[PDB]
Design an enzyme around this catalytic site. Structure first.
Site, PDB file in Angstrom:
ATOM      1  N   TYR A 132       0.789  -1.213   0.000  1.00 13.25           N
ATOM      2  CA  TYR A 132       0.000   0.000   0.000  1.00 13.25           C
ATOM      3  C   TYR A 132       0.814   1.250   0.000  1.00 13.25           C
ATOM      4  CZ  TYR A 132       0.935   0.438   4.964  1.00 13.25           C
ATOM      5  OH  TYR A 132       1.557   0.515   6.170  1.00 13.25           O
ATOM      6  N   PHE A 142       2.557   9.600   3.574  1.00 15.51           N
ATOM      7  CA  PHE A 142       2.853   9.338   4.975  1.00 15.51           C
ATOM      8  C   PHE A 142       3.280   7.902   5.221  1.00 15.51           C
ATOM      9  CE2 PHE A 142      -1.784   8.865   4.678  1.00 15.51           C
ATOM     10  CZ  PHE A 142      -1.954   7.544   5.116  1.00 15.51           C
ATOM     11  N   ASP A 143       3.032   7.025   4.263  1.00 13.87           N
ATOM     12  CA  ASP A 143       3.372   5.627   4.463  1.00 13.87           C
ATOM     13  C   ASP A 143       3.415   4.945   3.112  1.00 13.87           C
ATOM     14  OD1 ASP A 143       4.098   3.285   5.804  1.00 13.87           O
ATOM     15  OD2 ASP A 143       2.150   3.011   6.884  1.00 13.87           O
ATOM     16  N   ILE A 160      -7.970   0.243  10.691  1.00 18.83           N
ATOM     17  CA  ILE A 160      -9.011   1.250  10.722  1.00 18.83           C
ATOM     18  C   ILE A 160     -10.239   0.831   9.906  1.00 18.83           C
ATOM     19  CG2 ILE A 160      -7.581   3.208  11.335  1.00 18.83           C
ATOM     20  CD1 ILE A 160      -7.626   3.905   8.363  1.00 18.83           C
ATOM     21  N   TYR A 186      -8.377   8.256  11.639  1.00 12.42           N
ATOM     22  CA  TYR A 186      -7.817   8.689  12.910  1.00 12.42           C
ATOM     23  C   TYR A 186      -8.522   9.887  13.593  1.00 12.42           C
ATOM     24  CZ  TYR A 186      -4.449   5.275  11.450  1.00 12.42           C
ATOM     25  OH  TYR A 186      -3.841   4.101  11.014  1.00 12.42           O
ATOM     26  N   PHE A 202      -5.444   5.906   0.060  1.00 14.44           N
ATOM     27  CA  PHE A 202      -4.595   4.720   0.011  1.00 14.44           C
ATOM     28  C   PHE A 202      -4.755   4.009  -1.309  1.00 14.44           C
ATOM     29  CE2 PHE A 202      -5.377   5.023   4.517  1.00 14.44           C
ATOM     30  CZ  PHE A 202      -4.221   4.626   5.091  1.00 14.44           C
TER      31      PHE A 202
HETATM   32  C1  LIG Z   1       1.565   0.703  18.483  1.00 13.68           C
HETATM   33  C2  LIG Z   1       1.824  -0.499  17.682  1.00 13.68           C
HETATM   34  C3  LIG Z   1       2.514  -0.350  16.352  1.00 13.68           C
HETATM   35  C4  LIG Z   1       1.883  -1.237  15.276  1.00 13.68           C
HETATM   36  C5  LIG Z   1       2.708  -1.027  14.055  1.00 13.68           C
HETATM   37  C6  LIG Z   1       2.737  -1.970  12.948  1.00 13.68           C
HETATM   38  C7  LIG Z   1       2.285  -3.382  13.150  1.00 13.68           C
HETATM   39  C8  LIG Z   1       3.260  -1.489  11.611  1.00 13.68           C
HETATM   40  C9  LIG Z   1       2.165  -1.094  10.617  1.00 13.68           C
HETATM   41  C10 LIG Z   1       2.617  -1.424   9.201  1.00 13.68           C
HETATM   42  C11 LIG Z   1       1.792   0.386  10.776  1.00 13.68           C
HETATM   43  C12 LIG Z   1       2.749   1.428  10.167  1.00 13.68           C
HETATM   44  O1  LIG Z   1       3.945   1.545  10.889  1.00 13.68           O
HETATM   45  C13 LIG Z   1       5.087   1.726  10.088  1.00 13.68           C
HETATM   46  C14 LIG Z   1       2.080   2.788  10.182  1.00 13.68           C
HETATM   47  O2  LIG Z   1       1.066   2.756   9.199  1.00 13.68           O
HETATM   48  C15 LIG Z   1       0.395   3.991   9.017  1.00 13.68           C
HETATM   49  O3  LIG Z   1       1.322   4.982   8.479  1.00 13.68           O
HETATM   50  C16 LIG Z   1      -0.658   3.656   7.966  1.00 13.68           C
HETATM   51  O4  LIG Z   1      -0.318   3.819   6.615  1.00 13.68           O
HETATM   52  C17 LIG Z   1      -1.919   3.196   8.298  1.00 13.68           C
HETATM   53  O5  LIG Z   1      -2.908   4.134   8.621  1.00 13.68           O
HETATM   54  N1  LIG Z   1      -2.270   1.914   8.321  1.00 13.68           N
HETATM   55  C18 LIG Z   1      -1.404   0.794   7.936  1.00 13.68           C
HETATM   56  C19 LIG Z   1      -2.178  -0.183   7.049  1.00 13.68           C
HETATM   57  C20 LIG Z   1      -3.662  -0.425   7.406  1.00 13.68           C
HETATM   58  C21 LIG Z   1      -4.439   0.872   7.633  1.00 13.68           C
HETATM   59  C22 LIG Z   1      -3.623   1.522   8.735  1.00 13.68           C
HETATM   60  C23 LIG Z   1      -3.769   1.067  10.128  1.00 13.68           C
HETATM   61  O6  LIG Z   1      -5.020   0.601  10.498  1.00 13.68           O
HETATM   62  O7  LIG Z   1      -2.747   1.000  10.865  1.00 13.68           O
HETATM   63  C24 LIG Z   1      -2.969   0.334  12.096  1.00 13.68           C
HETATM   64  C25 LIG Z   1      -3.233   1.376  13.147  1.00 13.68           C
HETATM   65  C26 LIG Z   1      -2.208   2.438  13.439  1.00 13.68           C
HETATM   66  C27 LIG Z   1      -4.514   1.336  13.865  1.00 13.68           C
HETATM   67  C28 LIG Z   1      -4.776   2.219  15.042  1.00 13.68           C
HETATM   68  C29 LIG Z   1      -4.608   1.414  16.336  1.00 13.68           C
HETATM   69  C30 LIG Z   1      -4.908   2.324  17.518  1.00 13.68           C
HETATM   70  C31 LIG Z   1      -6.331   2.848  17.396  1.00 13.68           C
HETATM   71  O8  LIG Z   1      -6.638   3.628  18.519  1.00 13.68           O
HETATM   72  C32 LIG Z   1      -6.527   3.676  16.136  1.00 13.68           C
HETATM   73  O9  LIG Z   1      -7.884   4.106  16.078  1.00 13.68           O
HETATM   74  C33 LIG Z   1      -8.128   5.379  15.519  1.00 13.68           C
HETATM   75  C34 LIG Z   1      -6.179   2.799  14.938  1.00 13.68           C
HETATM   76  C35 LIG Z   1      -1.791  -0.559  12.482  1.00 13.68           C
HETATM   77  C36 LIG Z   1      -1.840  -1.793  11.612  1.00 13.68           C
HETATM   78  C37 LIG Z   1      -1.760  -0.962  13.964  1.00 13.68           C
HETATM   79  O10 LIG Z   1      -2.907  -1.712  14.270  1.00 13.68           O
HETATM   80  C38 LIG Z   1      -0.516  -1.769  14.341  1.00 13.68           C
HETATM   81  C39 LIG Z   1       0.486  -0.821  14.962  1.00 13.68           C
HETATM   82  O11 LIG Z   1       0.109   0.493  15.251  1.00 13.68           O
HETATM   83  C40 LIG Z   1      -0.188   4.541  10.331  1.00 13.68           C
HETATM   84  C41 LIG Z   1      -0.626   5.988  10.185  1.00 13.68           C
HETATM   85  C42 LIG Z   1       0.798   4.464  11.499  1.00 13.68           C
HETATM   86  C43 LIG Z   1       1.470   3.101  11.548  1.00 13.68           C
HETATM   87  O12 LIG Z   1       2.466   3.083  12.548  1.00 13.68           O
HETATM   88  C44 LIG Z   1       2.016   2.856  13.862  1.00 13.68           C
END
Ligand SMILES: C=CC[C@@H]1/C=C(\C)C[C@H](C)C[C@H](OC)[C@H]2O[C@@](O)(C(=O)C(=O)N3CCCC[C@H]3C(=O)O[C@H](/C(C)=C/[C@@H]3CC[C@@H](O)[C@H](OC)C3)[C@H](C)[C@@H](O)CC1=O)[C@H](C)C[C@@H]2OC
Ligand SMILES: C=CC[C@@H]1/C=C(\C)C[C@H](C)C[C@H](OC)[C@H]2O[C@@](O)(C(=O)C(=O)N3CCCC[C@H]3C(=O)O[C@H](/C(C)=C/[C@@H]3CC[C@@H](O)[C@H](OC)C3)[C@H](C)[C@@H](O)CC1=O)[C@H](C)C[C@@H]2OC
Lengths: 210, 210
Positions: A132, A142-143, A160, A186, A202
């Site tokens: 992605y 951003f990613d 999400i 977010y 995305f």
């Molecule tokens: C703390 C543990 C670290 C743990 C880190 C990983 C396994 C690495 C994983 C590739 C994430 C990337 O790290 C390089 C980076 O990907 C982003 O850049 C991004 O492109 C993104 O939006 N993605 C990734 C792909 C699916 C959609 C989404 C997401 O759903 O991401 C999910 C997300 C952040 C959901 C939150 C969870 C908290 C809730 O409160 C909030 O609710 C509002 C939603 C990811 C899968 C988390 O579940 C797992 C983690 O966070 C985020 C902008 C920030 C994130 O880094 C953290």
């Protein structure tokens, strides 16, 4: 270089405070707040040698007023970015949603299936394997899993809502563009790298569903 | 001589951080660890200029080991203190126990009855009300009930053994000096305000037995 530990560890402990001061300055710059770096260091040296030019009360109070400035500046900026990004986001989705091949779901998610793919409909408990690219509506990326190095796996219900919902519109082998409103991402808080009320774009390739 | 906020707050911020560092080094010093302060300020400046001679990885590696050295040295010092107090306390007890009117119980409690008092003596399930003053063998006072303007009540069996046993030696209205070995007190670990293996000296007045 370092003859031993009372040296190595000392330098590290110092390097670490340096680091920390640089990171801190970096967040103040987001608000147009630029502290005098020569003075920041002089304070550190002066204190470390017990020659501070300001009394403990003047230090307490100066910091107190400075941190009120920072918080008050950060809050205003959050507030304004939230309102600006909510409106810009809305406009953006509205325009894109009118384009050919683009659809709007009952939740406000806007998407464009690029390749349907073939196989089973992904469900909430499935693990999907994807490549992605994530960017803000202004083009700021951003990613990017691609430059990160490998395809990423996750439970469909662990991401999400914009994703949990979106990926169900395609199958393995497929490709979709998701334009996601903050309330399916977010929200107002945002997360590091994602400002308040950010609409996210995305481009997702769905490699496996298992 | 600060002319403006960007100058004064920066100095303040620095002084506050450097004072924080100095305070941690002062604690390291109590453990025999005296970091080279020239190297510490060298690291501050180098990292501040983005030229740390240690990478972020090395910094972290160095500080983890340094953190291990501190804890290990913390433990060594409690051990040396435990041994020093144990010895010093044994000597103090021995000298006092030889004096006129002083007795040594079978458990090693040393006590001096000042006033017998009159009435029932405290028994195990009883509640006692007392005024007391507690001091370490060097004269430092760690607790004084008189200063709270009120006596203390407790179950005889709920307190350290030296008191449980010691108060059975007098009756309501009596006074007794208790010189308590660490093993009938807080032992090798001590508690806040009471170092490892500390012998305790208590001057007690027994007001009620109920
Ligand atoms: C703390 C543990 C670290 C743990 C880190 C990983 C396994 C690495 C994983 C590739 C994430 C990337 O790290 C390089 C980076 O990907 C982003 O850049 C991004 O492109 C993104 O939006 N993605 C990734 C792909 C699916 C959609 C989404 C997401 O759903 O991401 C999910 C997300 C952040 C959901 C939150 C969870 C908290 C809730 O409160 C909030 O609710 C509002 C939603 C990811 C899968 C988390 O579940 C797992 C983690 O966070 C985020 C902008 C920030 C994130 O880094 C953290
Ligand atoms: C809501 C009620 C809670 C209540 C909490 C407080 C009022 C604590 C408050 C700061 C002041 C304490 O005193 C009033 C203070 O007392 C000392 O200064 C002290 O002079 C002392 O040594 N004393 C007090 C007088 C009798 C001898 C003895 C004691 O036996 O104290 C008893 C004691 C600590 C027993 C433990 C029990 C567990 C055992 O395992 C351990 O055995 C190793 C011994 C006291 C009476 C407890 O019963 C009282 C409580 O629990 C200690 C140096 C530290 C201790 O504060 C931490």
């Amino acid at each position: 270089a370092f003859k031993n530990d009372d040296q190595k560890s000392a330098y590290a402990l110092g390097a670490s405070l340096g680091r920390y001061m640089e990171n801190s300055l970096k967040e103040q710059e987001k608000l147009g707040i630029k502290l005098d770096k020569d003075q920041l260091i002089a304070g550190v040296q002066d204190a470390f040698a017990d020659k501070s030019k300001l009394s403990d009360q003047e230090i307490e109070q100066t910091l107190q007023a400075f941190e009120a400035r920072v918080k008050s500046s950060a809050q205003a900026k959050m507030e304004k970015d939230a309102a600006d990004n909510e409106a810009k986001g809305k406009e953006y989705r509205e325009k894109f949603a009118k384009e050919k091949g683009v659809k709007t779901s009952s939740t406000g998610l806007v998407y464009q299936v690029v390749e349907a793919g073939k196989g089973e409909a992904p469900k909430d408990s499935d693990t999907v394997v994807v490549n992605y690219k994530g960017t803000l509506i202004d083009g700021k990326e951003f990613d990017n899993s691609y430059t990160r190095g490998e395809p990423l796996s996750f439970r469909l219900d662990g991401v999400i809502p914009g994703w949990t919902e979106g990926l169900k519109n395609i199958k393995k082998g497929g490709k979709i563009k998701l334009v996601i409103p903050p309330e399916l991402a977010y929200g107002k808080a945002g997360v590091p790298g994602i400002p308040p009320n950010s609409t996210l774009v995305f481009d997702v390739e769905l490699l496996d569903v298992k």
